[PDB]
Design a protein around this motif. Structure first.
Motif, mmCIF file in Angstrom:
data_model
loop_
_atom_site.group_PDB
_atom_site.id
_atom_site.type_symbol
_atom_site.label_atom_id
_atom_site.label_comp_id
_atom_site.label_asym_id
_atom_site.label_seq_id
_atom_site.Cartn_x
_atom_site.Cartn_y
_atom_site.Cartn_z
ATOM 1 N N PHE A 1 0.786 -1.227 0.000
ATOM 2 C CA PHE A 1 0.000 0.000 0.000
ATOM 3 C C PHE A 1 0.818 1.277 0.000
ATOM 4 O O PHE A 1 1.656 1.501 0.873
ATOM 5 N N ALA A 2 0.565 2.122 -0.995
ATOM 6 C CA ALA A 2 1.284 3.372 -1.138
ATOM 7 C C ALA A 2 0.413 4.590 -0.842
ATOM 8 O O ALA A 2 -0.718 4.707 -1.328
ATOM 9 N N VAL B 1 -0.689 8.568 -0.968
ATOM 10 C CA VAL B 1 -0.716 9.517 -2.068
ATOM 11 C C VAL B 1 0.646 10.208 -2.052
ATOM 12 O O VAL B 1 1.147 10.569 -0.982
ATOM 13 N N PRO C 1 4.611 4.326 -6.222
ATOM 14 C CA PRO C 1 3.734 3.147 -6.309
ATOM 15 C C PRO C 1 4.352 1.933 -7.013
ATOM 16 O O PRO C 1 3.682 0.917 -7.189
ATOM 17 N N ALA D 1 3.951 -1.322 -5.070
ATOM 18 C CA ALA D 1 2.665 -1.469 -4.403
ATOM 19 C C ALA D 1 1.555 -2.059 -5.261
ATOM 20 O O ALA D 1 1.658 -2.116 -6.498
ATOM 21 N N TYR E 1 -1.955 -1.245 -4.219
ATOM 22 C CA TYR E 1 -2.943 -0.170 -4.163
ATOM 23 C C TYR E 1 -2.312 1.118 -3.651
ATOM 24 O O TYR E 1 -1.365 1.093 -2.859
ATOM 25 N N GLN E 2 -2.836 2.243 -4.119
ATOM 26 C CA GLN E 2 -2.343 3.549 -3.692
ATOM 27 C C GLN E 2 -3.547 4.453 -3.478
ATOM 28 O O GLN E 2 -4.549 4.348 -4.191
ATOM 29 N N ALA F 1 -4.538 4.396 2.204
ATOM 30 C CA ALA F 1 -3.469 3.397 2.233
ATOM 31 C C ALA F 1 -2.906 3.025 3.610
ATOM 32 O O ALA F 1 -2.702 1.847 3.898
#
Lengths: 83, 49
Positions: B5-6, B8, B12, B15, B17-18, B22
């Motif tokens: 998870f990244a 904002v 990314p 990762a 999802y961003q 996150a």
């Protein structure tokens, strides 16, 4: 050379010449020359005598090992044709 | 939970999802199954295999 009569070219540079000097002498050189510094047997270089590889060949080692093991399935029996 | 998870503005690349949520994402669980593909009925001859 041309000589022209009656004006003839003097028959020499004659005796009226001005001896200007007696500085004619080169004094012989006498000398003793000694170049004797201790010499040490070695010089350092980055590299001398090497014939570096431009490409090598590919090179390898080898291994094998194991045993002889197997799971088998055979064709069914069939009617024999002839003979 | 540290790579998937990244946030904002974060990189990314690694990762899954961003986004703004996150920091509070997490794996409930992960499962894997490995299938091996091979050739069987290893031949034998007068030399062996």
């Amino acid at each position: 050379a041309l000589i022209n009569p009656q004006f003839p070219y003097a028959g020499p540079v004659p005796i009226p010449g001005p001896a200007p000097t007696e500085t004619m002498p080169l004094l012989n050189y006498r000398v003793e020359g000694r170049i004797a510094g201790i010499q040490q047997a070695r010089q350092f270089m980055p590299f001398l005598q090497g014939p570096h590889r431009a490409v090598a060949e590919q090179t390898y080692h080898a291994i094998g090992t194991g045993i002889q093991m197997g799971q088998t399935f055979n064709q069914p029996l069939i009617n024999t044709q002839e003979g | 939970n540290n790579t998937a998870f990244a946030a904002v503005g974060a990189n990314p690349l690694e990762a899954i999802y961003q986004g703004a949520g996150a920091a509070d994402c997490e794996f409930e669980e992960i499962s894997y199954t490995v299938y091996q593909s091979y050739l069987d009925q290893l031949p034998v001859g007068q030399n062996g295999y």
